[PDB]
């Protein structure tokens, strides 16, 4: 009925905000570019999604052999695990803020709690989606209010000139850069769209002029990604206007935002706590939906590469568990350190953006053969190659 959808994923949340607590308005440009890129990529897969009656996974299978198949399957599994780790940490932090339970108990609750999603499914969709949409929209209103006196030409002229010296030299910059990119693309979204397009009442083969569906779907996808771009830009400039030009250059993870909202002077006293807990709720809900979307993606991947299948609850459970193991390892090793956990989170995102090319290459290749093809694949070519140079340099400086 009414509009309801969740666009903020803790990955992009932390990455964008961090990018505004440390370096300022510099990163802004990168965001745009990444967003634009994803648009194009969506387009591509959707074309592949609608013709050739296959899924990107099946595609990969039809250009490989058994072993390298195992390899790319490992890679896709690792991408999914990365996203799930991001999510579970998001949920754990949300719980620790709202209630007070320590992190380990929250992590365990999250991992073996998927029964909530069968319960609430038996409960009713429209209401829950409406209410979460309301709360997210309101949280975003709050952030907008919170942004204050600012100098536009700064943001602008830093968006534009793209100080390459800057964007490449600070190897702290490449880090959050790759973070933003790999959190704006999210390969699991690629596989999932490739599959989901396969069902829109197009006359599967008996309409050579089904491309009307292509145009409609691409329009939808572009609208979606555009609004995601606006949200990311907002979060970044928020981190900027709330932590920049200061002493000790506090990192700017989640906790710091949660406090800065509370102790915020001009917001009175109680309103601090009000917005605080609202933010907490938002974090939690975003985590959960980001989980639920990717289960189908994992299923599709395994069905494609190994040509095997499992019921969903087993899939979700085992993935979540193998995801939560690194969380607990890091917690016990580092005895609990918000700084250390948020650092793990960002490293997860950047690892996602490292894995991307192994799933980007075959997409381009396959769209170079069949009946429908892009005229200027050259954009994707330059994209992947510049990409490879960046990732290998960031690897090297280690």
């Amino acid at each position, epitope marked *: 009925m009414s509009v309801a959808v969740g666009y903020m994923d803790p990955g992009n949340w932390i990455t964008s905000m961090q990018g505004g607590a440390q370096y300022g308005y510099t990163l802004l440009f990168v965001i745009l570019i990444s967003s634009l890129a994803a648009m194009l990529l969506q387009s591509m897969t959707v074309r592949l999604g609608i013709a050739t009656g296959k899924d990107l996974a099946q595609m990969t299978r039809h250009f490989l052999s058994k072993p390298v198949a195992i390899i790319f399957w490992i890679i896709a599994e690792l991408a999914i695990i990365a996203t799930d780790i991001a999510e579970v940490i998001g949920s754990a932090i949300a719980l*620790d803020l709202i209630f*007070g339970i320590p992190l380990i108990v929250g992590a365990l609750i999250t991992v073996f709690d998927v029964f909530l999603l069968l319960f609430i499914m038996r409960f009713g969709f429209r209401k829950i989606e409406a209410i979460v949409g309301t709360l997210i929209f309101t949280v975003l209103a709050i952030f907008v209010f919170e942004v204050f006196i600012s100098s536009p030409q700064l943001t602008d002229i830093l968006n534009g000139f793209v100080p390459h010296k800057e964007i490449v030299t600070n190897q702290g910059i490449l880090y959050i850069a790759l973070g933003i990119i790999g959190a704006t693309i999210m390969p699991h979204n690629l596989y999932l769209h490739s599959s989901i397009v396969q069902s829109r009442k197009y006359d599967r083969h008996d309409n050579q002029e089904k491309a009307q569906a292509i145009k409609y779907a691409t329009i939808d996808s572009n609208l979606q990604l555009s609004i995601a771009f606006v949200v990311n830009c907002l979060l970044l400039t928020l981190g900027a206007a709330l932590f920049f030009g*200061t*002493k*000790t250059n506090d990192l700017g993870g989640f*906790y710091d935002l949660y*406090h*800065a909202l509370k*102790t915020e002077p001009v917001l009175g006293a109680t309103l601090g706590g009000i917005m605080s807990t609202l933010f907490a709720v938002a974090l939690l809900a975003s985590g959960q939906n980001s989980t639920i979307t990717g289960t189908l993606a994992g299923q599709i991947v395994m069905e494609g590469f190994l040509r095997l299948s499992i019921p969903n609850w087993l899939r979700r459970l085992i993935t979540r568990a193998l995801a939560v193991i690194p969380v607990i390892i890091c917690l016990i090793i580092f005895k609990g350190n918000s*700084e250390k956990i948020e650092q793990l989170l960002v490293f997860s995102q950047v690892f996602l953006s490292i894995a991307l090319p192994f799933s980007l290459i075959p997409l381009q290749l396959a769209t170079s053969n069949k009946k429908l093809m892009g005229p200027f694949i050259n954009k994707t070519w330059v994209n992947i190659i510049s990409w490879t140079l960046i990732v290998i340099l960031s690897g090297l400086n280690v």
Partner: nanobody, 121 residues
Framework: QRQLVESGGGLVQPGGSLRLSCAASRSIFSIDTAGWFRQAPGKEREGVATITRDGNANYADSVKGRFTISRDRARNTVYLQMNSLEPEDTAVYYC???????????????WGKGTPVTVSS
């Protein structure tokens, strides 16, 4: 120097354990650097531990093995868990801090009032 409130001291047999908790009075943004001092009744204010901005947990040279400082970045509260206590650790345990009220105001010191801790049969 007020607006900090330690709490948790109490009688304890030799070899017991307990967790003192420096705190804040109202809605404090962050605790830069803590420190727990001791002022046993016939000596000078010694000093027992020191966390830093991120984490350093530097200790004294007579306590490593029993005292585990920590922080709680969620509800700003330094902790101090003493384990396997001894009859030579009786004293009042002050708390130091480096409170910073809001995200842009400079730092500012603060001392506590401290709490007693007795160890005996």
């Amino acid at each position: 120097q007020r607006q900090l409130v330690e709490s948790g001291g109490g009688l304890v047999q030799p070899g017991g354990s307990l967790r003192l908790s420096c705190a804040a009075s109202r809605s404090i943004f962050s605790i830069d650097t803590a420190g727990w001092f001791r002022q046993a009744p016939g000596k000078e204010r010694e000093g027992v531990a020191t966390i830093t901005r991120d984490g350093n947990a530097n200790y004294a040279d007579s306590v490593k093995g029993r005292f585990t400082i920590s922080r709680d970045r969620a509800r700003n509260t330094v902790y101090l868990q003493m384990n396997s206590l001894e009859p030579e650790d009786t004293a009042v345990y002050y708390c130091n801090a480096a409170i910073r009220t809001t995200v842009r105001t400079s730092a500012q010191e603060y001392w506590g009032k401290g709490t007693p801790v007795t160890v005996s049969s």
